[PDB]
Amino acid sequence: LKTAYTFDDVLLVPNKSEVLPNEVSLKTQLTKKIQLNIPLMSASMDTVTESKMAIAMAREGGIGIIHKNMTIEDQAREVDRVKRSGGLLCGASIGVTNDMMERVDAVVKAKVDVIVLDTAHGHSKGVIEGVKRIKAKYPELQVIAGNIATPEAVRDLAEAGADCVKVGIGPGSICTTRIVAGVGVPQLTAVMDCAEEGKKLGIPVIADGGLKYSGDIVKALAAGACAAMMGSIFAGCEEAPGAIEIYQGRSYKVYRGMGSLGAMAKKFVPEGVEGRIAYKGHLADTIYQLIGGIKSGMGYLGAPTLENLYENANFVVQTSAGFRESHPHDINITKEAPNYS
Amino acid sequence: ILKTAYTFDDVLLVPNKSEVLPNEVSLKTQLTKKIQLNIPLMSASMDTVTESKMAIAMAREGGIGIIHKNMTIEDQAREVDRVKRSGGLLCGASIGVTNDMMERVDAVVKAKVDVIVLDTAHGHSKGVIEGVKRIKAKYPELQVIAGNIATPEAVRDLAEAGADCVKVGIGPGSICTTRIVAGVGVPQLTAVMDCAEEGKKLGIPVIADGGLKYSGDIVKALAAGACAAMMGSIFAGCEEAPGAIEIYQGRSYKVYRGMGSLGAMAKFVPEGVEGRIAYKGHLADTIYQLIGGIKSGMGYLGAPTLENLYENANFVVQTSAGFRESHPHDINITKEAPNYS
Amino acid sequence: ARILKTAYTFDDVLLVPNKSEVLPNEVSLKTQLTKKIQLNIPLMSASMDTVTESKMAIAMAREGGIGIIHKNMTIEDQAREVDRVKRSGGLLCGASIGVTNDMMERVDAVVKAKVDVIVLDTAHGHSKGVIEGVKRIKAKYPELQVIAGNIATPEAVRDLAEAGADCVKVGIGPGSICTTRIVAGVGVPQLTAVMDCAEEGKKLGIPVIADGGLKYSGDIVKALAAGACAAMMGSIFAGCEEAPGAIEIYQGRSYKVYRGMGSLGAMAKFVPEGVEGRIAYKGHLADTIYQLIGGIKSGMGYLGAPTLENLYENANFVVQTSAGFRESHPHDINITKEAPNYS
Amino acid sequence: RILKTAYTFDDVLLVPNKSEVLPNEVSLKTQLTKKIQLNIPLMSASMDTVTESKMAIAMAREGGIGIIHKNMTIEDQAREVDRVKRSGGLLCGASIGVTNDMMERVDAVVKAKVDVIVLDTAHGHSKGVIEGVKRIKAKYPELQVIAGNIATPEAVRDLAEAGADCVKVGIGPGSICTTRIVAGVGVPQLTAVMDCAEEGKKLGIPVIADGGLKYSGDIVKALAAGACAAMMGSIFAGCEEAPGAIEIYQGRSYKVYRGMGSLGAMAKKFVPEGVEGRIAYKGHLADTIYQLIGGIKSGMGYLGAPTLENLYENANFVVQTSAGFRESHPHDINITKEAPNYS
C-alpha cells in the first residue's frame, strides 16, 4: 500500500529568486481558449456562486460557475446577468440527466463561456458519453469534465473531448463522500498524479476542494493544476447567496454541500453536510489576501510565471510535529489575521 | 517488529472507471456455502444489540442477527423460535466455550437456527478448535462460524477444525478495552485483509467484526475481502435493540456496553466498558443509510457485485493530515446528517 | 544521514494473538529480578517520595512484588524504613542509593537493616560515577544485589554488566512526571529502549527493568514481551492509599500528590527535570495490583504463553498509527460507568 | 516530486552516551565568527517585541548577544547600539534590511561600534541579499555579516560566496510565523539546520538555528545538529527586559509578542506572514537564561560532551512518533505547580 498526501502533509522548498512578489504573473489557461488573469474559480454551489458571485470573480480576473440547483430558465437568466455586466467570463454546471441538453441550450443561448459537466463520479459512462454528445451538438463549446482523481480518468475524459478536467473526490470541507462511501484520494497526490497526465495530453486540470489557505493554492499550482476551485474560502463573502446570521457577537453565512440534505431537497443518502462559516466581508478582500499569498509563494520559489513554478517546485513531507511548527505555535493570539483563521 | 498495520481510518479506496450506477449494483453475499444474504450486514451478539426483535428486523432487511447468549438456554431457544416463526427468516445464535455448550447448541438447533457463532475472546485457542469439532461431530450440516481471530494462521487452523466461516476482530470494538488491558490486537483493516486473503485460498468466508463507525468502513471491509460486516455500535441505538432509553438534556440516549464489561458479566477484570449512545430510531432507517453508502462506494469503483469490488479495489494510505481532509472541516455543522455524527 | 531509526513506545505497537493452549488463570507471572532475587509478580514500586516508603514497600511485598525505599531522607531514616519492612515477616525490600560522598555510609546502614537489593539510581546511569559506584559497592559487599540505572542503550547494558551490575534499570525520560526529554532533548522511546536493552541483556545474562511510562496493564504486557524481567511504576501506584502524601480535593474529588524526584518540591538555583501534580485517589494497593495482574494474565493467554519467558520468545509486534490508537481505546460512546482498569 | 520527509525538533530525540563529565563540567563556549566569541550560544531575535538596548545589554552580560531590531529610525537604532556598547564594551548586533536606505543604516550602526550586522530578510536566497552582502563587504571588509534567512545548502553556498561570515537558517518555524500557511513555503527546522550546517562545514561558514525553539532541549538538538548558536524570540519576549505591554488573562500576566511580518509590526493593504499575540511574563532575563543554560548543560552531560564540538560529533538522533511525542511530555497527571523550565 502506497501513501498519498494532502496539502498539510507537504511544504515547498525555497529556490534562488531574482523576482519579488509584486513582479510575478498569475495568468493561466483554463482551456486552450479561455485565459484567466488569476488561477481562482468559485465553486458551483448554491451557497457560493450565483450571478453576483460570478460577476465579482470575473472582475477580479477569475471565473465563477453558476450552480444548477435551479430551473433551466433561471440558470440561463443568471448567466445572462453576468454576460450583460460587461462581457465578463461565466461558467455553468450541467448534469448527467434526461434534460441535459435542454439545460445546455439555455446557457449556451445566454453566451456562457464554459460548461462544467459536473458529477459525483466523473470517470463514468455517463460523463464520457455526455461530453461526446455535448461536443456533437456544440463543437466550439468549452467543456470541463469532473470530478476525477486518477490519471486513467484524465485519459478517458480527454478522449471523450473534454477541454479541461476537474480533480477532486472527497477533499471538500463540507464533503462526507469519504465517510459515507470510503472513496477518495488525498488531494495533493490527486492533483500531482492527474496534472502529470494532463501535461502529457495537453489538457489542463483544476484542483477542486480542500483548499483552506493561500498556501494551499500555491501547493496545488506547483503540483501542475491550471487553476484552483474553492467553496469554503468564498462561501463567507457577501457576494455568495444567502444572508448573514449573527451568533454570539460574530457573523456567519450558511455553507452546505450540494449532496447535503438541504441542497438536495430543493429518502436519500447524503454525501455532504450543512453548517455555517464565519463572514469574511467583500470578495475583493479575500481575493487580495489569496493573490498576495500566491505571489509571496512564487517569490520564495523564484517563479515569475505559474509554469516556471511547476517546473522548479520541490516538495518535502512533514510529520504531525512539522505540522504544529508550520502553524503559529506556543502563543496566545489576541488579534485575528486577515489571512489566518 | 513485524510491520505497520492499518485500520479503516488509515486508508481510502481509489475510484475506478465505472459503467454502473449505485442503484444497479448487487449486494448479495455468501455468508457460508449454504447461507446467502441479500445484504452483507450482521447485528452483533450483545445483550444491548440483538434479541429476537432485532434479528427479525435484520432478517427482514436481508441481513442476519446473532441472538446473544447472556440468557438461559431456554430463553435463547425461545428467541430463535420467535424469529423463525416470523416468515421463515434467517437466524443465528451465539454459543460459548462453556460446560453447558452442547446443551445450549442442542436447544438452538431444535428451534431450527440456521447458523451458530462459537465466539470467545481468543478464538485461536484449543477450546474453540475442539469446540468446533465437537459441534460439527453431532450436527454435521449445521453452519458454524468461529471467532474471534486476527491472523491467517488462526484462519487456517479454524478452517481445519470444520468452521464454515471465521470472524475477524480482536480489540476494534467501540466498547472494547482488550487492547488497553492486555496489549493485544491487530488494526482491523489489516486483519480482515490478511485473514480474507488466507480465507479465500481455503474457500472460507471471513466476517469483519467490530470497529465500524460509518458506511464507508463497511465498503473498506468488503473491498478487503469480508463476506459480511458485523456491527454493535451502529445498530445499538435502534428501536429493536434491548436497553432502556435515558434522557440527557432533552435528547434520547440508549445503553450500550461490552460483553466483557462489568455490567454484562454480572472481583472481575473487565475488557469492555458501559455507556450510552444516541437513539437512532427504526433499524430499517439505519440500514437504508448504510446500504445507500455501500452502493455509492461500489458505483465509485465500477463494481456491480461484491466479488468484483474485491478484485478491483485499490487502497491508498492517508496521513493524519489526509484524515482531517477526509471528514467535514473548517465549518460549524448546524444540521444533523442521517449518516454522519 | 544522522536520522534513520524510528523508535517506538507502548502506544505505537500491539501484540498479535498466537495460538493458545492456556487460559488466563493458568499462566505464571514469576520472574527473576536478579539471579538471587525471585518475585512472584513482575511489578516494582518506584523509588519516589510520593510512591514508596515502608507502608508502600510492605504492601507491594505481600502481593508478590517489591518496593524500593526512596533516598530523600536521612541515612538513619532510610534504614528505619527498610528495617520496618524487613521486620514485618521478612518481606522483600529494596532501597535507593546515589553517587555521593556518603554513598557507602548510606549503603552500610541499609545493609545493616537487611535490605535485599540496592538501586544505584541516577539520572544518567551510563556514567563513570555509576560504573565506579557499582565497582566500589561490590568490593565492600560482594553478595549485595545491585540494580544500576537509568539507561537506554545496549552499550549501557554491557558497561554496567561489566561493572558488577546484577540488573540494569532502563528508562530515560518516559516518566509521566518527567521533563528530561523536554529540558535536555535526550531519551529513547521506551518500548524500543527496552527491546534493545533486553536483547543485549539476554546475550550477557543480566535482567533489565522497564521503568517509566506505563499507564495500563496492557503496557506492562508489552514491556514483558519486549524482554524486561520486571516493570517499575510510579504513576500507577501513586494514587493508592499506601503511597505517601496528602489528600487534596479538586473539583469535589479526592487526589493524592505525585511529583518527580527531579522536581523543585522534591529537591527541597535548581534546574528541574520533572514536574509536580496530583492523580486521582485509587484506594488500596490490593485493588490496583489485582487489575494489573488480571490484565497481564489476559494478554499472556492471548499469546499462548504460560511463562514470561515463553511470552518473550513468541511475541510478534505490529505498529499502529494514530488512527489505530483511536480504535484501540473505547470510541464513539459516552462512557457512563467507572471501569476499574480504564479511566 | 516529493523529495523526502523532513523533521523538526519534536520529531527527534538524542540518544544518551557514555559520559565522564557532569553537567557542571561542560563548556558552552561558542563563536559566531573567530572575532565574535560567545560564552553561551544564545541570541535574542531582532524583533520589535524582543530586542532593544535593554535586552541586548542583559543578553551580553549573560554571555550571549542581542540583535537590535530595525523597526525604528536609523538614528534611533544607532543610539540603541551606542547605548549597549557603552555599558562595559558589551557585544551588540543590529539588523539590516534590503531597502533603499540600507547603506546609511549600516553606516550608522557601524559608527556606533556595533559588532555584527544581520542582513535579515524574508527570503535570504535572493539576488537582493546576495548583492547586499557584496555591497556591504566591499565598503566594510572587516565588518562581520550574518545573512539570512535560508533553508537549503544551495542557499548556504550562495551566501557564502557573496561574502557572508555567518548564515541564519529558518524559513517558517517561528512561533508567530504564518509563512508556511500563507505561502506554502518552508523546511522543517531540524532537517534545515542539519543540512545547512553540513553544507556550512564544507565551506567554513557557521550557521545559526533561528526560530521554532520552545524549550532548552530544542536548543540542545539544534547545537547537536551543527548550529554554532541559537536565536529565539518567543523564549525571551516574556522576560522583563523585552519591549512590550503587559496584558492580563485569567490570573497570569503576559507580554505582547508579534511577528515582524504581522499587521501591527508593519504599521511601524498588507498581506501578513506573522501573527500578533502574547506570551506569559517570565520575570528577569537572568532566570530564563539560567534555566536554558542548565538544560543545555544537562543534555551535554547525557551525551558525554565537554564542548559543543564534541556534542555535534557524537550526537545520535532517533525519530519518535506522535505516540512517543506524548510520552516525551508529562502525561496522565494534573500539573499543580509551575516549573521554571516547563509550561
Ligand SMILES: C=C(C)c1cccc(C(C)(C)NC(=O)Nc2ccc(Cl)c(OCC(=O)O)c2)c1
Ligand atoms: C458532490 C457529490 C458527491 C454529490 C452531489 C450531489 C448529490 C450527491 C449524491 C446524490 C448524494 N450522491 C451521489 O450521487 N453519489 C454517487 C456515487 C457514485 C456514483 Cl457512480 C454516482 O453516479 C451518479 C452520478 O455521478 O451522478 C453517484 C453527491
Ligand SMILES: C=C(C)c1cccc(C(C)(C)NC(=O)Nc2ccc(Cl)c(OCC(=O)O)c2)c1
Ligand atoms: C469479548 C471479550 C473480549 C470478552 C467477553 C466476555 C468476557 C471477557 C473477559 C472475561 C473479560 N475476558 C476474557 O475472557 N479474556 C480472555 C483473555 C485471554 C484468553 Cl486465552 C481468554 O480465554 C478464555 C475465554 O475465552 O474465556 C479470555 C471478554
Ligand SMILES: C=C(C)c1cccc(C(C)(C)NC(=O)Nc2ccc(Cl)c(OCC(=O)O)c2)c1
Ligand atoms: C530522575 C531524574 C532525571 C532526576 C532526579 C533528581 C534530580 C535530577 C536533576 C538534579 C534535576 N537533574 C540531574 O541530575 N540531571 C543530570 C543530567 C545529566 C547528567 Cl550526566 C547527570 O549526571 C549526574 C547524575 O547522574 O546524577 C545529571 C534529575
Ligand SMILES: C=C(C)c1cccc(C(C)(C)NC(=O)Nc2ccc(Cl)c(OCC(=O)O)c2)c1
Ligand atoms: C520574516 C518574514 C516572513 C517577514 C518579515 C517582514 C515582512 C514580511 C512580509 C512583508 C509580510 N512578507 C514578505 O516580505 N514576503 C516576501 C516573500 C517573498 C519574497 Cl521573494 C520577499 O522578498 C522581499 C524580502 O524578502 O525582503 C518577501 C515577512
Ligand SMILES: O=c1[nH]cnc2c1ncn2[C@@H]1O[C@H](COP(=O)(O)O)[C@@H](O)[C@H]1O
Ligand atoms: O456535498 C458534497 N459532497 C461532496 N463534495 C461536494 C459536495 N458539495 C460540493 N462538493 C465539492 O466540494 C468543493 C468545495 O470544497 P471546499 O473548497 O473545500 O469547501 C466543490 O467545488 C465540489 O467539488
Ligand SMILES: O=c1[nH]cnc2c1ncn2[C@@H]1O[C@H](COP(=O)(O)O)[C@@H](O)[C@H]1O
Ligand atoms: O466487552 C467486550 N470486549 C471486547 N470486545 C467486545 C466486547 N463486547 C463486544 N465486543 C466485540 O465488539 C463488537 C462490536 O464492536 P462495534 O461494532 O465497534 O461496537 C462485537 O461484535 C464483538 O466482537
Ligand SMILES: O=c1[nH]cnc2c1ncn2[C@@H]1O[C@H](COP(=O)(O)O)[C@@H](O)[C@H]1O
Ligand atoms: O523528576 C524526574 N524526572 C525524570 N524521571 C523521573 C523523575 N522522577 C522519577 N522519575 C522516573 O520516572 C519513573 C516513574 O514513571 P511513571 O511510572 O511513568 O510515573 C520512576 O521510576 C523514575 O525512573
Ligand SMILES: O=c1[nH]cnc2c1ncn2[C@@H]1O[C@H](COP(=O)(O)O)[C@@H](O)[C@H]1O
Ligand atoms: O512575522 C514574521 N514572519 C515569519 N517569521 C518571523 C516573523 N518575525 C520574526 N520571524 C522569525 O521568527 C524567529 C523567532 O521565532 P521563535 O523564537 O519561534 O519565536 C525570528 O528570529 C525570525 O527569524
